[PDB]
Amino acid sequence: YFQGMDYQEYQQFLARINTARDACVAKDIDVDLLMARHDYFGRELCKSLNIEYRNDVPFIDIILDIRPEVDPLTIDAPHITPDNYLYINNVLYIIDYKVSVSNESSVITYDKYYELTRDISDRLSIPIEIVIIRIDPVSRDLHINSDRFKELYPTIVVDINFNQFFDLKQLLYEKFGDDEEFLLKVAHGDFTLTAPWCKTGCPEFWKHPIYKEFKMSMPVPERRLFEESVKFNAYESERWNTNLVKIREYTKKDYSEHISKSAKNIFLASGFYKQPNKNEISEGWTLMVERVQDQREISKSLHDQKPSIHFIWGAHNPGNSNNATFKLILLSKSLQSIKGISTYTEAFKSLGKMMDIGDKAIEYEEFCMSLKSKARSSWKQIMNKKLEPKQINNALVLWEQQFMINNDLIDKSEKLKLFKNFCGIGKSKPKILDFDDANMYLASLTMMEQSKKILSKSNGLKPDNFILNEFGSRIKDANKETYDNMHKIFETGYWQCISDFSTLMKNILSVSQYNRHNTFRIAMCANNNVFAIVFPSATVVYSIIVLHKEEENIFNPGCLHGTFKCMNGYISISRAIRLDKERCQRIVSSPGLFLTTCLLFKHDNPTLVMSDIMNFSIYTSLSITKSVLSLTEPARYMIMNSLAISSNVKDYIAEKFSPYTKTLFSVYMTRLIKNACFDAYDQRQRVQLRDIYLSDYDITQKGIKDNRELTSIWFPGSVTLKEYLTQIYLPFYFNAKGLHEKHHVMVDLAKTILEIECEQRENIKEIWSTNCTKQTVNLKILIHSLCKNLLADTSRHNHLRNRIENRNNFRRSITTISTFTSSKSCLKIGDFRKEKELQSVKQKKILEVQSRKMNYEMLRNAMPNYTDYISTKVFDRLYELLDKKVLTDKPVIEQIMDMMIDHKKFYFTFFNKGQKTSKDREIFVGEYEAKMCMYAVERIAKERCKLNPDEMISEPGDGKLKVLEQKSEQEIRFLVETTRQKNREIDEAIEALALGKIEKLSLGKAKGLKMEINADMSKWSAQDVFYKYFWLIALDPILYPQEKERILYFMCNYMDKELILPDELLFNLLDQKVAYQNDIIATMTNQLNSNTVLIKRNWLQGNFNYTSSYVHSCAMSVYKEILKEAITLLDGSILVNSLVHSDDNQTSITIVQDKMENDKIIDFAMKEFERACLTFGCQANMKKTYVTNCIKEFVSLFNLYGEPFSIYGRFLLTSVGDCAYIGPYEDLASRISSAQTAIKHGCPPSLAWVSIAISHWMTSLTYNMLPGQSNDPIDYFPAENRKDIPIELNGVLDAPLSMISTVGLESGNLYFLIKLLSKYTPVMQKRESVVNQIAEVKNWKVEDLTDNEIFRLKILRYLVLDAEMGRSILTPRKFTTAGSLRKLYSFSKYQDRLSSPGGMVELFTYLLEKPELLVTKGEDMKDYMESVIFRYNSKRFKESLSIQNPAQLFIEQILFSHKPVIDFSGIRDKYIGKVTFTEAYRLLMRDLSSLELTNDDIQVIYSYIILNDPMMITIANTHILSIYGSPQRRMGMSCSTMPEFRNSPALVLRAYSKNNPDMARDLVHLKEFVENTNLEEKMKVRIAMNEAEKGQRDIVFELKEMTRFYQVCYEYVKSKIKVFILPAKSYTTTDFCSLMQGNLIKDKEWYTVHYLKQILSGGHKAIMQHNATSEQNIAFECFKLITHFADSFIDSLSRSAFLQLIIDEFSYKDVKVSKLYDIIKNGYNRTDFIPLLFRTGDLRQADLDKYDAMKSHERVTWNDWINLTITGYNRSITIIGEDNKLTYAELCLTRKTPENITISGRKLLGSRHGLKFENMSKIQNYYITYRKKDRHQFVYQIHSHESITRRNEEHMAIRTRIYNEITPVCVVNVAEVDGDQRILIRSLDYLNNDIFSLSRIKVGLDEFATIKKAHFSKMVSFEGPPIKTGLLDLTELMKSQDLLNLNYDNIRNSNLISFSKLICCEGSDNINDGLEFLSDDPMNFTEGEAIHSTPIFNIYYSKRGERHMTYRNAIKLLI
RNA sequence: AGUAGUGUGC
RNA sequence: GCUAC
RNA sequence: GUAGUACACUACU
Ligand SMILES: [Mg+2]
Ligand SMILES: [Zn+2]
């Protein structure tokens, strides 16, 4: 599937770039490239419009075609020309094609054409409606201004890529990037700046102390250059770049000497780079053990271990009942009957007696049911009615399973002992286990063996559950082996153990919510032997109790307290486990993690044992402590740094790896990591490159081979490199969030900040250096590299300031920016005494009351220098600053420039992210003015970084994966081209001779080397020299001097910023009672005198990422120049690519040379990478930096050898819990979005379905909707199973996986409607498009539908149509209180506006008189303030402002499941107290039968969710029209950006509100699509009805009606870069949908998909012309296939008989080939099928003519020895002269314009010519010239005399490029004539007497006429009578799939089963006589040649073979 | 007891 | 925290 | 100031 070009022209463009040297020649190449892009869009657009593609016809020809009756001279015409014309229903349309991204050239051509044709038109009286059609190439959408043109073509389906023009322009600007005659000519205009952002600067910057320090640090001339550069105004100078050129030429000497010295270091390097090996890992391990022993308390006792899993387990007893009361009685009689005397035994007997109800069970059940009936009858909680414990028998029963701790049944000593020593109620180095010990590893191993012994037995249960019963069909359809592995998981005791711990922990969390201080509760699970006592206590204290018959038959992961002997067997109690509800939340969701981990480690690997995988994964998925976190995150660095070529894994293991082994699984996993480090050294050389298939267009096969030679890490077996990287990188995503205590991480973060600040105060003094001193910057090199990079990026794009002002909204108001109006944290530096002491006395008073039922003034006294701070939200702080008139509604950049002076102190505080690493990171909360100023600086740096092709800003949404792939593929192509070019003579000599000479001849070949530096930077923001950014701001030409001066004054005040210590950190450190010894906190704060520390050199994390990105890419450009000069010293080639993302780096180096060894080059390149980072004040973290040959690794994205790769398991594991617990639909939608992101990153289909199954399971677990539970909707609706219920009513998702990954939870409704169309549309239009099936809904009989279908249509008609803001229906309504909502200023204004005398009605009428800011916000200050007051009435917003843990949200959605939480009033009023779920079900099914379903209801169902979205139309057309092709393996994967299927909401809703379209055509067409629906009047009928039944006019009802109206209009209107990983590169949109359906149907292989009709429709308006274009495309595919099939596979003597036999009785894609051939013969592009029309005999002069009219070739004559005739299309020259002197020269053209004369002179004087024009002549008017070019090169083109003088002047600029005149020769007489026809219709039949080929005929001497090619996979869609030819059926050859290959080897080595399809003899006598009806042309045989590189690989390419390699010979060898 | 910790907490 | 007196 | 502070699982085991 090639894009849009061919061999003939794409190779010519690639050649014409790769030889030129002149800037005029390069500009001509660029203008020809833009012209070819224009011509390509013109051809495809005219093909789409089904009009004739004209060739820039003049107005004379247009009028003489539309009035072919008048005199051709009288009525006038201008001398300009259109692109094409169109005259229909007596209106002439004039058409122009633009491929611009700007709209300005379109309107310039509009008012350039309009007035000249209005001069014409009111003479002949014809409406000339001129049309411009502007395609945007980077985002393909059409801009047709002529709205009188769109009613003929309301949708246009042009689906072409402009990428192969972009890469051509890319390599063109790559080649002449350093040129300067090129750039100023290819400039879009002159360099312009906009208005200043401020009038005045800051004179106080020049006397600021930080500037004084910066200035005194530099030498004197750099002080002069800095001062001279700040005061430089680019707008006031004659050249904008005179400053940058001046400073560059100043520092050039030191720059050149530095690059030359560092490049001369290529010879000083002996190649002993830091390899990893066994000694380095062993010595680093020994240093690690010494460091960890001297930092930890290393214990050798075994019983110092901590619980590896906080749970013990034993299997169930099938002899007992699984009844709740019976299990309660059994737990009581088992706890009381304990034999023996241990410590806590009498306490356990007393607790067994406290839950003893004896024989009184019915009383218990009745009492508890009465209480639950009273609790469930209210939405709110039951208030002011106390719970009395009822003495049932011997238990004081408070609720169901909540018993009172009776002091009469326990004695006080045992009670104290149990609550104190066992439960911990009222109780110096960190102790870890000795991982390095022998007996401790033996004990850990024995634990793993015992757990594998007990848990791998069978359950005895049935293996089915929700996952299996609802999704196992789809899972088994994608992969049977995943279904079998999942069945094997479900059979074992692993799954039952983790399911019991999930169910039991959910019950523990449900039960401990309302547990009291004197009650204990019992939690039960489905296992009738596993129990839990939840102790009185927010955290959870529980203890597992296991009943078991035989002793030692318990799963004990280090958690057991003791086993005891009871009645009927043994009883085991675990220790008390105290957990917070977050880790319990992760335990609840752990079966999803276990199943995902097991099936993902197991996936497609028959060498792994499943019980080993389960034994590892039950401990990693149930790990909720830091002990495994200390192993999973360092394991990446240890195993990858010991796998790599070069790293410092000794320094990482010695200095950074610190295992923290408190459990025994930590010890076992530590030994796994150690043995994998050793083994990873042992297996670097088992990584093999896959063979690379090329075509000179694309790389088809690529990557690493899939050999299982690698040693598996976490469990025994063998493994692939992809599976090895999975086992390395996946366990970091096993870690939990929120495991950190704030208590310790605030101290750790503050210590890190203050230690770096202290060391910088007392040790770091030098700012600039020259010897790579740490935390210094080389000054000359910084300045020179910045001047070079600013000159390149600024002279490339002149309007950069305008781009920065538009894209970042600098000219608009601050209320229109999402960054300044968010809900993030801000900071207020004021005097907040009163509010803090109010909340302090309230929490103390509260504390005292809770201790009755059984400080900030301290800090303000004990700290004098305390600044006072508070943390509001961002939107509230903007509201406060607008209400206090600090900020206004001016343009935001003027306010930022004012704030850069007005705000002089910056305060930053911090808090913990709570991430899943070992040491937590921190985010720095700034105050609001810091956010404004850093917004200005960072948006300037951001939009300068996006100019760079290798700075990863523009595509943050995983386009970095696509960029990595592009870089890797061009480095593969570079390595192949360079090694085959340099070593061509030596390989010719090797093949010549070829034994002994060949190897020593090979010894002197050019060796290829490919290197990838996967670098991290050490302390990126902390140890950074901030003074280099002063040179970045000062050298920037786009800034006025006042703007530079204010931004640098902000920089200087920012180096005086202060870090506020948070108040809880100080409350920690003041209440310590012992002085911490070497206290860095008390030193830096002067013994806690203050809470602020002046942080200076550390700019904080996340504040200057783009500025640092820009200087980091400058450092990498210096590195690139060093490497290029060093490899030119060796006279080799080099390609250096470097990707930069702030603190990450990926530099890839490809070198082909022959002088020295590769190890010395690796040593040089790594030493110079370190030095290039150090010269700009960076330092590459050499402990975390590694070097490979194959693997790239950018920000968690891989690239193996050109094949992209990602750990998709992180998105599978995130999908287990990621939800805010809003409702079932919203939770399910969030989880499925995570599964979609997994699919984009290369997840196989079966694991994606396992993820969707787990998502449905976890969402139904949250709301008690599992089958059989109380909210199971299955018996409350008319449905067979859960697939037949809509997702809004809590059913499961039934859809194809490609449909889920494209839309997701709109796939259920869409697939239901596609099933309805497949069931109910009439039988003739079954295989028709979706628009042709939706229109025939009118012929449905709705009476005899299925009642399930009527129910599902009525839900969608009445509830999904008129909904609010995929949408839900049954959301539970949480009763939350007033939240905090008192720190806010805006809520306070809402409160004293609510209780105001008539103020709220003023707000409501202000909203209603300007209603657009109900679904947007406002431009103005005032309306932003009014709308942010109005958003408090939304209870969703009020509760979203509250801080909230999601674990409590989970527990509350569990517990409020039987309570009436569904507001059925809002459900009922959409189609006409609170309600439970089941009553919502009953009432909805009752009220829905009250409504009626008509045909017009179904019409507006299909018009709302299919026909009004082009995405839904194309997805439905993919599912209807699919044809699945042939299976094949996924050998080369590739990245494809998801296309936009639609070919500001503030602007269009303000436009529709105030009726002003303000960009001019989008708004009026979109308000047409708004006004056309006309369903508005029912709203105001409801308004009048409410005014009737309430008398007075209502306003709140009018606001609710208007909000519903604008939201259901916003859904019609709806006002991202998504990269996928597909088995091939898609280019079009149909290619993407084909690859998406083929990828997502099996794990083992992908299918090719092609479609019947055009799947890209535009809507229900253009039907007939859509069918016309679809049939035209089918005709095109049919005859491309037939012509190439017949001249590729059939005998040359018999093809036209074959062709006529195909044309008569055959049909391609259900359309007869006769009809398709009539379509081609009658269309306007017959020239595309000239050999077809010739072989059938339907070819006319016009066709052929129109062929050389629109397409061409240069023709020379006359090599006699004196007159030359160079003819082209309407272009011919005649040149008359001797060897010395030329007499005259006559050009001949079609039009005489000075552009076309030079174009024709360029093209006609570049073919094979005689001589070099070697004389001159004085000259006065067009002439032929030549410039000289070094080593016998010249350029031959016609200039004007004036242009000869001008270009001689411009190349006589005082420069270094050596001057070459264009010395001119002979006069050119420019005439004009009609060009003759070069291809007569009768001039072919002699020329093709021996050309027997249906797809290629001769038209010239050496010009052919071809038909394009089409893939043979589409040959299965033919249909017809078997063509018996002797013994073969060629119809079966068309339907074959193994024999249609074009390779000779794949048919020669093919099978007899594949050939037995063809045989149909009926009486022959020889195979040789029957095989005569086949091809005799030589086929293509793939030949692979090894590439001389250190990652050694083979390339394979097609060849023409020899004369014997035919098709008949392959069939005969097969036979 | 559990969790966190070469910062005294829960 | 919340609810009632 | 006093009193109150309300609920899920219930399973093939
Ligand atoms: Mg990295
Ligand atoms: Zn036969």
Numbering used by the authors: -3 to 423, 438 to 547, 555 to 871, 892 to 1031, 1039 to 1409, 1423 to 1529, 1545 to 1615, 1622 to 1636, ...
Text taken from the publication that reported this structure:
To reveal the structure of the C-terminal region of LACV-L and the overall architecture of the complete polymerase, we determined the structure of full length LACV-L (LACV-L FL) by X-ray crystallography and high-resolution cryo-EM. Transcription is initiated by a “cap-snatching” mechanism, whereby host 5′ capped RNAs are bound by the L cap-binding domain (CBD), cleaved by the L endonuclease domain several nucleotides downstream, and then used to prime synthesis of mRNA2,5,6. The previously unobserved C-terminal region (1752–2263) protrudes away from the core and forms an elongated arc-shaped structure that includes the mid domain (residues 1752–1841 and 1978–2025), the CBD (residues 1842–1977), and the ZBD (residues 2026–2263). We also capture snapshots of LACV polymerase in both pre-initiation and elongation-mimicking states, thereby revealing, amongst other conformational changes, the movement of the priming loop that unblocks the active site cavity and permits accommodation of a 10-base-pair template-product duplex, characteristic of elongation.
LACV-L FL was subsequently characterized by cryo-EM, resulting in a 3.0 Å resolution structure. The resulting “stable dataset” was further 3D classified resulting in the separation of two defined states: (i) the expected pre-initiation state and (ii) an elongation-mimicking state in which the complementary 3′ and 5′ vRNA formed a double-stranded RNA that could be accommodated within the active site cavity. Based on the RNA promoter sequences with which the polymerase was incubated, we expected to obtain only the pre-initiation state. In the pre-initiation structure, this loop protrudes towards the active site but is disordered probably due to the absence of RNA and nucleotides. In the cryo-EM map, the polymerase is monomeric and some density present at low threshold suggests that the α-helix 91 may fold back into the same hydrophobic pocket of the ZBD, although the binding might be rather labile. The C-terminal extremity of LACV-L is an α-helical domain with a long protruding β-hairpin. Its two equivalently sized sub-domains surround a metal ion that is coordinated by the residues C2064, H2169, D2178, and H2182, suggesting that it is a zinc ion.
